[PDB]
Design a protein around this ligand. Structure first.
Ligand SMILES: [Mg+2]
Length: 580
DNA sequence: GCATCATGCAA
DNA sequence: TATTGCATGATGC
């Protein structure tokens, strides 16, 4: 049965009530500077559909959109807020976002449209977006009648589902998580995405030019060492040259051919000079394809800015994700890739890039939740944790810790935070499982509190059915009761890791909210540009650096109070590369 | 065109 | 057989 609504030709006063479910539709997946194809409003007075060209040109509607006292319930308000920002219109008063509410109730559902969220509550009187717009090439906005009813049905579902969702959030003790953390953060992300990051495309082109030269030389050298040419990029064609023509050992093979991943090639390097060249070709090639060419593809030709979209409702841990481009995976570890960061520059003259990052927030969070005396004391002394861990598991004094010991203790630390596995540790360190297990047992002997936590959290996930974070984020772990070892083991690792990665996510998100409140109080021109899990990157007038050197770390360190201190480092410079 | 896998970049 | 992600070139459907 069809849904009743008014297909309005003009905006009326009753469409502007104090509370309503609002739908400002942007069909294009990337909403930056994208069209708003239709608008729906559902309130106490009824259901309405407005053509965007008329609604967005109506002073009364635009004023209502920006009146913070007129509350709106929406799904993905960030997408609408950004699309409206590009049209110079301010969206305020969003008091409920169904996408964020659904995400907090269960990130595993993978809710990405109103239909999916409604299903959680046995409401199916709304179609999935894909069913209406189609996918990929067949994608498309349908005719007005079809479009109009879809938007109205979505607004009706939001109107209906707000109460039940808020009720369950409250039961879960997640009401504040949504209203005080994710919803306000959503607005901050929209500002960040809208602001964008300026790119020095001439610099990017210079780099790509030299990469091309280098790639060509290595490529030539590779054909030289193989005795012929081939597509170095087809691990299969590649696998034949290496494991058949050159007879390299096959210590790993793919579910369809031979494995030529870097860890494998690294072990093969000693047998033939072609290997080091394949690795080098892989490095340069990755930079070229993904970071020079890929980047340039999404830079706005007029402003030379890139506008990522932070997916706030996707990761199972509470972390954000970044796409088109992903600005959370720009090279830094190897000097050659790190140069890519030289192309990310301030958007205004005489402005600089300022980057602040937490020092070992995950291990500090672990010390806090595990309440391990040894680990807490280590951070109270602000010790180098990897050196301290080597000292403890290898039983030596700081002076006797050698570089190899620190490196191995470091790997143990990563395994501890990821959810320890002897096989996992063995693989990483390239040692036997028995040897890795010995390392782990030594670790647990030195950090008895961490051992008890890992044991207890797994039991808790089994008991309750989920694990939670500092700020009450949750993740259900159904596989924790699986009678399949591999399946259960993975869920156990998640139980151990999620509260750590998730709490660190909780902390930096609150820091962003706190930081923006402080920047507004001080009327500073500085503003957030990016978040990369444990770090915040802003740009600001060179004249604000000194104030920022004091403000940013402070706000970040004080976002949450733990049993150990939080410590934030920072740097700034003329490009992202100089901020580090 | 569209999905897959193998690869590699980040925290 | 360590945690969470996203983009790419191949390859084939
Ligand atoms: Mg750091």
């Amino acid at each position: 049965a069809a849904m009743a609504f008014t297909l309005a030709d003009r905006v009326t006063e009753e469409m502007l009530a104090d509370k309503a479910a609002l739908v400002v539709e942007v069909v294009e997946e990337n909403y930056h500077d994208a069209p708003i194809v239709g608008i729906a409003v559902v309130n106490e007075h009824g259901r309405f559909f407005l053509r965007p060209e008329t609604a967005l040109a109506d002073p009364q509607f635009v004023a209502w959109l920006g009146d913070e006292t007129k509350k709106k319930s929406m799904f993905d308000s960030k997408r609408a807020a950004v699309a409206l920002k590009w049209k110079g219109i301010e969206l305020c008063g969003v008091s409920f976002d169904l996408l964020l509410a659904a995400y907090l109730l269960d990130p595993a559902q993978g809710v990405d449209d109103v239909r999916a969220a409604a299903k959680m509550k046995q409401y199916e009187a709304v179609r999935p977006d894909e069913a209406v717009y189609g996918k990929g090439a067949k994608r498309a906005v349908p005719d007005e009648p079809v479009l109009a009813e879809h938007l109205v049905r979505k607004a009706a579902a939001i109107w209906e589902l707000e109460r039940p969702f808020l009720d369950e959030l409250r039961r879960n003790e997640q009401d504040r998580l949504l209203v005080e953390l994710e919803q306000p953060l959503s607005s901050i992300l929209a500002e960040m995405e809208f602001a964008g990051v300026k790119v020095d495309t001439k610099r990017l082109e210079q780099m790509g030019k030299e990469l091309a030269e280098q790639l060509g030389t290595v490529e030539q050298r590779i054909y030289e060492l193989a005795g012929q040419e081939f597509n170095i990029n087809s691990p299969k064609q590649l696998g034949v040259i290496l494991f058949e023509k050159l007879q390299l050992p096959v210590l790993k093979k793919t579910k369809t051919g031979y494995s030529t991943s870097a860890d494998v090639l690294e072990k093969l390097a000693p047998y033939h000079e072609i290997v080091e060249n394949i690795l080098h070709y892989r490095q340069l090639g990755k930079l070229q394809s993904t970071y020079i060419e890929g980047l340039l593809k999404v830079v706005r030709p007029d402003t030379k800015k890139v506008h990522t979209i932070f997916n706030q409702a996707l990761t199972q841990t509470g972390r954000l994700s970044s796409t088109e481009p992903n600005l959370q995976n720009i090279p830094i570890r190897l000097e050659e890739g790190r140069k890519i960061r030289q192309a990310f520059v301030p958007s205004e003259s005489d402005w600089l890039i300022f980057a602040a990052d937490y020092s070992q927030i995950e291990l500090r969070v672990l010390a806090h939740i595990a309440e391990d005396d040894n680990l807490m004391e280590a951070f109270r002394r602000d010790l180098d944790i990897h050196t301290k861990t080597a000292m403890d598991i290898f039983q030596v004094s700081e002076d006797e810790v050698t570089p190899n010991m620190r490196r191995q203790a470091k790997a143990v630390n990563f395994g501890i935070v990821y959810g320890i596995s002897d096989y996992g540790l063995a693989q990483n360190l390239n040692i036997s499982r028995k040897e890795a297990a010995e390392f782990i047992e030594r670790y647990f002997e030195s950090f008895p509190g961490v051992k008890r936590y890992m044991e207890n959290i797994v039991q808790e996930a089994k008991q309750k059915g989920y694990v939670t974070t500092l700020l009450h984020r949750r993740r259900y772990l159904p596989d924790i009761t699986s009678r399949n070892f591999n399946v259960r083991s993975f869920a156990e690792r998640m139980a151990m890791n999620t509260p750590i990665q998730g709490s660190a996510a909780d902390i930096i998100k609150k820091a962003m909210i706190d930081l923006n409140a402080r920047l507004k109080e001080e009327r500073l021109q500085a503003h957030l540009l990016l978040q990369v899990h444990d770090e915040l990157i802003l740009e600001a007038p060179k004249e604000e650096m000194e104030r920022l050197c004091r403000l940013v770390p402070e706000v970040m360190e004080q976002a949450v109070t733990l049993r150990v201190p939080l410590k934030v480092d920072y740097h700034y410079g003329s490009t992202w590369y100089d901020a580090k």
